Structure 1
Amino acid sequence: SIVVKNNIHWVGQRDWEVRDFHGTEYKTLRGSSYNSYLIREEKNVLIDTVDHKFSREFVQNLRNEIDLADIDYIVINHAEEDHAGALTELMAQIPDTPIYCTANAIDSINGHHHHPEWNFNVVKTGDTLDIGNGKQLIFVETPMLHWPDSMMTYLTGDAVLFSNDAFGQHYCDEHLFNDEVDQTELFEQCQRYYANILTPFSRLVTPKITEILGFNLPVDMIATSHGVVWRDNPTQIVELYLKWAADYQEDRITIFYDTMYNNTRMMADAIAQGIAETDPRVAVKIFNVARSDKNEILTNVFRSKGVLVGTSTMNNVMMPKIAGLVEEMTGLRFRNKRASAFGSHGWSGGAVDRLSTRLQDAGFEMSLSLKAKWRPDQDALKLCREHGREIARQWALAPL
């Protein structure tokens, strides 16, 4: 275990190997960690657990730290499998140990473990749990951030906010604190996490943070459920979350597509050229969805003021990877972004119009589409390049 602060002990688990989260929809290229915390005052409190894969390691490591019978309270901020996966194994040893959680957590815990006989304690915002030595736990409900059962736990005196998933990131390192790791890699994992997971709940982020700030609770450290502990200027991640929640966008355009004979690819490259020579302010990224990291594409979409999506017509519909990606974007609900569909066709086409409509369904403000037949020649590439010019002028943040 690792000492977080005073009697707060990190009893979590590092995961150097993990590459797949949420099925295969989240790629953790830099591993992850599952942070659990054991507070040892007059009362002994365990906060969250770890992933199911390390259930047996978690209990044994917990035994080495403390006798399991001496654990007074268990706090579950969130009942996902990567935080409550090792709960059943633990409760098999100490079944009478009370669990403090939200009302919705009772539904989610019993939903997976099927053990309603456990001693649950419903907590709501403002409720306190005394642990002795002048210290107490304060619970703060955060529904749909990013689950209905989600909440945070604050420890007075030590001024530590156990925020669970919030302000966390999938980043595995031997060092525990934020000032001990690579800042660039840390920022990348943080933004990647928010973009792919927390984007559709952005409307709830700012009012919830504003509510918490009103409590006037001092914050020395922010101990999340994933990655580093924020101890050096810990509110820096809170400020990033405030920026990212306000329909975040940079002067940036992301282009992604799928192609069978690179005809649409040629269109994509030509569009990008037109943009660059019209608006030097705009940063442009190009991706082949069949050949690229999906989460990286989505992170760029999150950072972009607008996107262009390319697809060829395949059996009168669009290419499935493009279709799948558009479906996911519809769930993420990007805001204040604009889009334009493009692609090549053989005869009757139809996929480009089909794509433009589904992009509109995803919440994008649509501009005119760009269509081309077979392989674009020199004249056709001019029209594609011209299309990029028109997009740049329309989506300009400022004149010229």
Structure 2
Amino acid sequence: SQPVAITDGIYWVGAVDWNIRYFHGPAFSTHRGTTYNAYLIVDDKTALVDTVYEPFKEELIAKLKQIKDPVKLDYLVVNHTESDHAGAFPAIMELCPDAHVLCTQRAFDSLKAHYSHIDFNYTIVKTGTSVSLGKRSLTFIEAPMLHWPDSMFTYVPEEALLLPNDAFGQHIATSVRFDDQVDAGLIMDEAAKYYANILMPFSNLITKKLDEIQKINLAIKTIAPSHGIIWRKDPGRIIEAYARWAEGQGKAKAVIAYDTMWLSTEKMAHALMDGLVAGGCEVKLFKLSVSDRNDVIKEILDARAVLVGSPTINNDILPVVSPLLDDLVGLRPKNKVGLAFGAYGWGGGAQKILEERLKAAKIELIAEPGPTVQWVPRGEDLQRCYELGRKIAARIAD
């Protein structure tokens, strides 16, 4: 209800969403809700950075009024136009028709598309352009595909404050606002779940952007994303993390996701696992119909190996295994080795589909024609899987 000062004249005026359990419709599971972060920079001219998810506009406005009532607003920065950040645009614009919009070109197009019927003053910004607010100013950095084509970060020189919008955020609801008021390991895990499910496909763009920021030698003292905690005590940690994740070196870990109807594919999953562990490798095993897809993807970000298994039903794979596969193809895991496996009763069919989809995700099969078994595994069948797991372990070496 109350705004929170990041420093004098700079306030967090977002909204906390405790009860939301799924983001992007079904796409992302938020076991602990999330927040919609918006920032108010007060000066000779005052600027509001991003807005809020439409259902929380009241909270935005109520917080704005707590800093200064008749909401002033000279500039309204729109770093991103998805709905969780631009949904309260009509309301804010209605509250200050004179507000000057600062956004990218693609942003401007999106904004006219999602709202039209709303006229407003503006200026398309590009990497490097800068507006002054008086004592402080805000410069911009275009971030195409650093989630969306319209994406961009805002930087406040005078304070070394970076406002990347989605980048560096984590989906978590707390009444506390800063990284130093939260458990280090828990918040870094949320951050990884975030990266893995949203930024994984743009890993190469992340390093490029990180380097650009590195060259220009930008001083970053605090990072305020659009979701979650504000990295005020140690931005370095999250920046180093993004670099490692985007590089994709990985860790000597393997994720095995699968499902079964009568346990044979499971017995194979188990043997494969034993081989992987014997080869000195950490293993995470997921029975998909009982695990969270986003929690599985998060584990894959650091894994060097991804094994997926399934029996064949009606000459296809088991439908619970589909989500993970189409999600992998779209997320484009970088630098991963893999394997498909599973049982069958007569003709088979799921193995082709599994290898097809795994290759479409650019994951290199450690073995064209993966382990397959008819009806039930026998001693040598499980032994072969064990050896295979041992092979994968040797390659994921480290």
Q: Tell me which interval the TM-score lies in, with the shorter structure as reference length.
A: over 0.9
Deviation at 1:107, TM superposition (A): 1.4
State the alpha-carbon separation in 2 of the partners of residues 297 and 59 from structure 1: 38
Instruction: Indicate yes or no: 2:283 matched with 1:284.
Output: yes
TM-superposed CA distance for 1:59, in Å, is 2.0
For residues 373 and 155 of structure 1, the distance between their equivalents in structure 2, rounded to whole angstroms, comes to: 63
CA separation in 2, counterparts of 1:319 and 1:183? 38
Following the alignment from structure 1 to structure 2, what is the Cα–Cα distance between the partners of residues 225 and 358? 33
CA contact (8 A) 2:248 2:302 kept: no
> Does the 8 Å CA contact 1:248/1:302 hold for their aligned counterparts?
no
Verify the 8 A CA contact 1:127 1:139 in the aligned structure 2.
yes
Partner letter of residue 74 of structure 1? Answer: L
Please state how far the C-alpha of 1:268 moved relative to its aligned partner: 0.6
The aligned length equals: 394
Equivalent residue for 2:358?
Answer: 359
Question: 1:326 touches 1:358 (CA, 8 Å); kept in 2?
Answer: yes
Secondary structure of the equivalent of 1:99?
A: strand
Letter in 2 for 1:308: L
- Structure 2 CA distance, aligned partners of 1:232 and 1:17? 28
Contact 1:138 1:154 survives alignment (8 Å) = yes
Query: Where does residue 303 of structure 1 map in the other structure?
Result: 302
Paired residues of 1:8 and 1:38 also in contact (CA < 8 A): yes
- Contact 2:329 2:361 (C-alpha < 8 Å) held by counterparts: yes
Deviation digits for residues 88-110 of structure 1, max 9, x if unmatched?
12212222211100011011112
The answer as to whether partners of 2:254 and 2:306 remain within 8 angstroms in 1 is yes
Distance 2:235 2:203 in 1: 20
CA distance in 1, matches of 2:256, 2:52: 38
Whether contact under 8 Å (2:304, 2:396) holds in the other structure is no
Aligned to 2:397: 397
Q: C-alpha offsets along residues 357-387 of structure 1, whole Å, 9 cap, x if unaligned?
A: 2211110111220001113244433333333
CA contact (8 A) 1:68 1:94 kept: no
1:256 deviates by: 0.4
Query: Mapping of 1:136-175 within 5 angstroms?
Result: 136-175=137-176
1:1-16 equivalences under 5 Å are 1-16=3-18
Q: Is the 8 A contact 1:199 1:333 kept in 2?
A: yes
CA distances 1:294-346 after superposition (whole Å, capped 9, x unpaired):
11111111111111110111111111222221111111111211111100101
Corresponding residue number in structure 1 for 2:328:
329
After the TM superposition, which parts of structure 1 deviate over 6 Å for at least 4 consecutive aligned residues?
Answer: none
Gaps of 5+ in 2: none
- Counterpart residue number, 2:340: 341
Letter in 2 for 1:48: D
C-alpha displacement at 1:116, in angstroms?
5.3
d(CA) in 2 for partners of 1:341, 1:81: 38
Q: 1:228 Cα shift?
A: 1.2
Q: What is the identity, as a one-letter code, of the residue corresponding to 1:283? A: E
Judged with a 3 Å threshold, the aligned counterparts in structure 2 of structure 1 residues 301 and 69 are, in CA distance, closer, same or farther, namely closer
C-alpha deviation, 1:389, in angstroms? 2.5
Partners of 1:293 and 1:360 in 2: how far apart? 23
Identify which of 111, 114, 121 aligns with 1:112. 114
TM-superposition CA deviations, 1:162-215 (whole Å, max 9, x none):
111111111222221111111111010011111111011111111212212333
What is the CA-CA distance between 1:68 and the residue it aligns to? Answer: 4.4
Whether the 8 Å contact between 1:316 and 1:349 is mirrored in structure 2 is: yes
1:66/1:298 CA distance change after superposition, 3 Å: same
User: What pairs up with 1:208-223 in 2 under 5 angstroms?
Assistant: 208-223=209-224
Q: Alignment partner of 1:3: what SS?
A: strand
Gaps of 5+ in 1: none
Q: Which moved more, 1:136-145 or 1:367-376?
A: 367-376
Matched position secondary structure for 2:347:
coil
Q: Determine the structure 1 residue equivalent to 2:316.
A: 317
Equivalents in 1 of 2:217, 2:332: separation in Å? 32
Q: Which residue of 2 aligns with 1:195?
A: 196
2:353 partner letter: R
Shift of 1:54: 0.9
- Classify the secondary structure of the residue corresponding to 1:63: helix
